[PDB]
Amino acid sequence: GEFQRKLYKELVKNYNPLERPVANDSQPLTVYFSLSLLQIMDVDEKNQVLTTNIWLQMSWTDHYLQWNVSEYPGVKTVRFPDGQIWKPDILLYNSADERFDATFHTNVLVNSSGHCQYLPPGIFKSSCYIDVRWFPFDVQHCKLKFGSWSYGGWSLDLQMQEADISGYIPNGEWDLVGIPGKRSERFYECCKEPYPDVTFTVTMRRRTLYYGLNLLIPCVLISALALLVFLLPADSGEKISLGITVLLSLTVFMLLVAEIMPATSDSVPLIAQYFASTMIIVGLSVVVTVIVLQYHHHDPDGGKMPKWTRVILLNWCAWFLRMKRPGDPDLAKILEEVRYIANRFRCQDESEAVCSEWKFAACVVDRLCLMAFSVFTIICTIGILMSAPNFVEAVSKDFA
Amino acid sequence: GEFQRKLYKELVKNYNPLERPVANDSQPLTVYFSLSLLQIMDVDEKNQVLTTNIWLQMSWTDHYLQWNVSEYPGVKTVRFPDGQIWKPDILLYNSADERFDATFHTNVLVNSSGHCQYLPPGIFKSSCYIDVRWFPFDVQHCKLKFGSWSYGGWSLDLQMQEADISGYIPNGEWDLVGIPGKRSERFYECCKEPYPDVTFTVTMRRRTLYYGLNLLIPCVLISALALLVFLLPADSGEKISLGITVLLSLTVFMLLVAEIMPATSDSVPLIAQYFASTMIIVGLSVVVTVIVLQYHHHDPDGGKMPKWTRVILLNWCAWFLRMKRPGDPDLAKILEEVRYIANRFRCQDESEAVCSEWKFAACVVDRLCLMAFSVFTIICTIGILMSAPNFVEAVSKDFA
Amino acid sequence: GEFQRKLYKELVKNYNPLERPVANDSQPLTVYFSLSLLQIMDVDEKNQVLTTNIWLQMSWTDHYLQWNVSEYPGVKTVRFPDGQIWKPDILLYNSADERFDATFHTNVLVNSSGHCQYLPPGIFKSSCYIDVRWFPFDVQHCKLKFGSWSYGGWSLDLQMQEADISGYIPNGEWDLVGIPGKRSERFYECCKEPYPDVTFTVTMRRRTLYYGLNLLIPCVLISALALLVFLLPADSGEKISLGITVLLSLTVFMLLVAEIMPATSDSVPLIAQYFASTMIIVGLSVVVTVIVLQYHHHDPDGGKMPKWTRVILLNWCAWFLRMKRPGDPDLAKILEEVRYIANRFRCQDESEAVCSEWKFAACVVDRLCLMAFSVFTIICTIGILMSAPNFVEAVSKDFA
Amino acid sequence: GEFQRKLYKELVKNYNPLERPVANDSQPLTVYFSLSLLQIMDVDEKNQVLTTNIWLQMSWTDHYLQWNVSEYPGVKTVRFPDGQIWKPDILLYNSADERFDATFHTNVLVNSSGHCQYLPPGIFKSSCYIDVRWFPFDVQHCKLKFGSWSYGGWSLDLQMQEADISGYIPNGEWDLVGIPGKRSERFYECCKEPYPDVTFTVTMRRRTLYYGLNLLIPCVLISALALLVFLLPADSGEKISLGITVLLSLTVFMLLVAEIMPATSDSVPLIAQYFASTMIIVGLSVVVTVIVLQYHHHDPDGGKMPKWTRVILLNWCAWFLRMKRPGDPDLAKILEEVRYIANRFRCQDESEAVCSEWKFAACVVDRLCLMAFSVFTIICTIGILMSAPNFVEAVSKDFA
Amino acid sequence: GEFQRKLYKELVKNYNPLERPVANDSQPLTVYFSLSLLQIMDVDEKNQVLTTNIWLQMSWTDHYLQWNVSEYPGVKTVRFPDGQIWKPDILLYNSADERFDATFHTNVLVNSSGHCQYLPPGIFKSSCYIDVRWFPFDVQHCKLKFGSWSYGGWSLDLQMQEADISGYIPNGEWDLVGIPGKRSERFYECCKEPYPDVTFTVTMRRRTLYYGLNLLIPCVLISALALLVFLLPADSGEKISLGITVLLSLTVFMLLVAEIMPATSDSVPLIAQYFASTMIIVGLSVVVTVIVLQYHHHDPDGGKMPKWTRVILLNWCAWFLRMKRPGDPDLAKILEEVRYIANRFRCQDESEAVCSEWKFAACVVDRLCLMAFSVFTIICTIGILMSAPNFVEAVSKDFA
Ligand SMILES: *[C@@H]1O[C@H](CO)[C@@H](O[C@@H]2O[C@H](CO)[C@@H](O)[C@H](O)[C@H]2NC(C)=O)[C@H](O)[C@H]1NC(C)=O
């Protein structure tokens, strides 16, 4: 319209985008800054980078861009692109994007009295410390620091407004505990003037159903399956195969776990402790199985069972576990030959009895170690899992 | 020509590209918006991003860009590049691209009476919720929300038109169901003026032939092979090794499947339930194999067969399964020797009888568990596979 | 020089880069379009994207860029950069690049009579359907569709010229069959004016030496090795281990091939059919091995061999394979004791004979299944490989 | 300063950056072109690209940018940024980057006498054919082609200078042999105008210590370990597991090497034929092991051993291999039973004496195949490794 | 404000952003350069690049941009954007980014006396040589080389200020040691003028808790478990299975380690030496196991034990290891038929004695090799781990 054209022509006369729009030069310009979170796109733990979608909110007052609406009956607000108006240089300090600024430059909407709004959208990638000590039951706090780059405290007065989460779209993996903000003032080695900034601390909680049913339960099941090696009879020579293949499955699971975790040396993660405990238990079970097989195949005349071992294994541990241990001239020549055969059979019977005793001792050791290893596995698993904080509330929120 | 040159020179006289091309400033400007889909290029479930190829269609009326064809006989339409004509700032709200605007700026074609058309092509990436509860028999609805950033409802009148899919190129993995659209207007915390927007909901269905052939058939066949352990004689030791190798194969298949799936905790996927059921069945098979092996290698004099075990296995189940039950002084001194030899043979005889009885019990247990596990696996796989909605439709559309 | 400076000053006088350089505003402007292929950079089958290196070739005639060479001695050609003279807005419709234009804007060479040439180099990513039905003996036709975006048939008359391949650099994996071109005009839902375009079809063939030697032959030897299970004697307990290990290796190969191929449900790939056949054969071999082991370890007193089973296995198949089937009062007490031992030995001998007969039947079944499986796998592999079209051409070209 | 301010004001007066700075328009402009390499950042064989760090060097003479130093004391050189003075359009033809140009436009430094110098830096990404025939002992020649895009020899005649490698930073994998340059002069069919271009050939030699220590040596060790199947006694049923597990390790190594290799079908690479030979050797070892196991477990009465098998294995191969051949009325009825028992024992001993011959034949075949396979693997490995032309150079430079 | 509006109008009057802002053109302009480090974002060992977050700091003095604060009250500083005032062209030579300059162009702040400050932020990708010989216990020195591109001695002399690390954010992987810098002069053959540059050497120490808990310890544990083959009785067919399964775990773990190393042939890394040592240890263990099994299953009448072998393995080593050495006519017919049985039993007994001697010799060999390998592996591991510098500091810092 003619009035719009006239206003647009009159508004830009003698205007200078480099100038701060203040009536008095020695007074700071107040700028209100706020943030609107729409979605959390990614939390990369290996690279420790948070990718979110946010709209910035910058509102201030322009002294020159004012007019009387009576003289311009139709128009009420105007709009200016980048480069034709003065804008604050609000930047994210801890950005991780290759381009340090990742905001789409939209229009600035101007009031009939000079008020200016600026709502640029953006996919922001920032670097925040990520703690994996209590993984997967962890809670993360990532900071977002915004501030003016070249305007101090005596030039641009930054004020904070509470963040907006009405448009938030819930994420599948991460809950949103919340985003509080605070305004701080700092001194930099460059200069001798305070530089205010606004920091929003996004606090999220990880939902644990996926990891719990994909990574924890299989490990428990395989660890419990590794205990069947103590139930197999020694004659069926397939004990080392069982133990070593369970160990192989466990170590490939360990590699799968480690491929998604950053190589930080602050502390030992909970799942790392879990996998170490499972590794140790399976290795000890393999060692015990080797000892049991050594007992089972003992050479009957190789040696004698020591008295202490005989007592401990035969009369005490069997009592504990309620196990019962099993069990005419020509005539003389024929006589001595059949006597020789009978003596040979008697010696064979004694050797068999000794072998049976050794086999029973092996079975007793096997059962005792089965009981001990089951108790160890249960106690270690329960302790490691319940050591983490907020585990109860994570379980209650996710699995129930 | 001279007419074209003069018309271009005249049409830009006192033209401000910063004003809405309207005759009456109070009245809004109507802009017709539409979309033209060309190809659905990618659907990333892990990152939950939809990548498509679309042409936007914007149509409006410019009041200043009008002329008489009689004065310029040759010229009928003109073309204005980016930055020299007023264009709506319509963009995608939910964009998952590093640059928030992924459209290609092209010329605007202008009528002889002020009708401007704008057809910018683009490769658009958006973030939409991906539901994997019914993988692979799932249907996805992804929303594209377009709107003007800085023009409210009192200055811009966004009117929806119907999407065009006449040039759509079918995809080899996703079968397009449709793409309806709807207009809405919302209130934002920024301001006190309604803002309209247009949302197009792409509804698509996944073709399941590839997944059904490459992922479900191998698992079914491998689980069926896992049931061969109950048909394997216990004399040859190959049962534990076979079962554990099948377990390893299931583990690698599970990791391969989980490599491509989102780590969400909204619900337990159907494929995850299927894999868990198969894992449990194979683990129970290994446990039963251990029990049968322990029964078969039972030492003869190490105990007596319980009456309950006898009455459960040796008679009842054998009847039900129709398995037949398999069954001068020297003239003195030589006599006790031959009696000793005969008695030793007799003792060996009834020991062998007891061992044969135990082996028959083991065979009975093997047959029982074979039947039970076959029934269980068939029921479980059929129920899990058929529990998903629109599964018969997917089968009848892909396989037949 | 002075003449060059004068000419450059005169040419840009009153020149508008927005108008079509035509003497008459009604007649269309003829533009000659051509392509120069340099290399086939990539063919992503999984994403279905063709990346090529090409020089476009646009030629037209400009009415305003003319001068008399006599008045400007020495200068015979001028050059104008991007944004100072009119250029066609020719784009690639099938672009899969994040930016719809992947051309490098070079200079425009202008004649002494107004003939303008424009050869912008570029690396182009386009979307074409990659058929994988006959992997790896397949031929691909990928389309590159170029056209003007905002100029209709009444303004820009597009013309086609034969593509140039004189600078083609041969690719190590693809053989260029050819690159024909066609010109068509289509009607779009936007407007009521035809829009001409030029489509170039790149037809190329895949060389099948790498795949044949790395992926098909090793599977053939693995399948052949799987047949050795029908030669191991049953006493050596390794048949199940061999079969299951071969099956695991085949599954690993299956995952390796599956991770490069698209997830399309359009058709069943030939390689998928071939691997499915190999896996089915191996599984059937494992089942047959289980049956043979069950026959071999038969209880001597379990059950008599059926008459039909005897008359078949021990006679018909036995003759077919030309294998022959193997084959004083104390004196009374002494006699009665010796007779019992003799009778026990006789019973043992008869049981041994029965066991030997069962083992011979198992061997017969083993050899019969060996012959059957070898024939079946040979014919299946030959048929699947030979079913592909141009298989003979591919093998001849890539091997001989 | 005022002097350089006045100089800058005077120089750009009536200056056209589109004009070729030559005093005489008929004469062409001499441009000296050179390259300075700093680093071979990457050599990708799968994608066949070369990434290097390069400073270009362009030198020419300007006719209008000249001044007298006496009139402007203290000013000897000036500097002009991109887009304000004429610059050559030299480009790299065989580029492999999404943007065709990969240079960083720096300033142009200018003489007091008009000689212009220009040194843009860049991370250049070109495409060259990477031969892989003699991998790892391969030498690569990659060509960089530079030329003007729209200037001929009667407008701009390119010259040469030797490439500078004084600042080259040695790479840890590739050894630089040289960077020779060739100046090509192409003629068209229309015109006698030369067209000069400059091509630089980077010659690189791969340092093979890493590959020879991580791929060749472990494969040799595992293949040698695979030869122990001919040393294991057949009684311990573990002759098949060794071979199958070694074959699985070989397949894993083949997958590892195939992950990094291009899919070109130009020739069979050295590492590929090496792994094929090892595959064949292992498979033949498994077949021989099956034959030996068949010999060992022969039935005692399943058929007389062939005369040829006797006369060869038991005599000739035994002589060669220096292995020796290992090795009242009731009283009559009592007599009959004792004779029966003795005859049974005689028959058992005679039958047992037959199996010893089969076991000895198995041992003979085992040792003979051991020596044969040792010779085979040694010959194949030595020949395949020494077939490369650079083997001696590589082993004398890297390992020594 | 009117004062700053007038000041901004006055400052840019006759200002040329091309000339060097110095009062006397014969004197160099002093520029102070430094940087502030914020974070070490990534250290890529495979690609040999270093990603850091850095704020440059360049300060100088401008002769023209000066004013008296009395005439413009309330205005103390001004801000100019890129392209409106002169700035140094300081770049980083070691850049590894696609765009050579990765800095972000912010405003330049000018005081009342003409002092100019410029602090652009950036994420810089440098290319520094990474020495991986002592990995994990590694210390890295990475150089950043900053300098002007087209300014020399009497044009611009660069001066150093100390780097600032007061804002450094600790990394969980690398422990920063220091960032010492150096100002260096390069002299040309042209003329006596220094060319200054500034080099900053970042020294980082890797924190080795993650690697020591994920690579070294599990390798030690599995290698120790590989020694259990020397405790398994030979009667259980699992020695080869144990050894080769441990070998498989070792080789897959080696492949994982090689996935993260760079393919540099300058030196052999510590972890590679350790893995090779474990390879040889396990292979020799397998060979010894084969020899022991060969001794165990020796034919009783296939050859007497050599005298040397007897004296070595039955007296000397047995006393060393303290192993006990393990454990009417018819009557004539009866006599003859009984003597046969008696003599056969005696022959069986003596053959059993020979077999027992062979088995005891095998056990002695097994124990000897157990002790030898147990010493060897400990010695090799301790030596390899302790052969690295700063190992004691690394453990005492990371672990304790
Ligand atoms: C404008 O800013 C500069 C910042 O360097 C001031 O220069 C410093 O001023 C302090 C105060 O006397 C001195 O201690 C420093 O030695 C100065 N630095 C240098 C390199 O000279 C400068 O004084 C300020 N000018 C005005 C009018 O405020």
Ligand SMILES: CN1CCC[C@H]1c1cccnc1
């Ligand atoms: C044929 N052109 C290219 C695609 C749409 C169509 C068009 C028509 C009018 C204005 N812009 C584009």
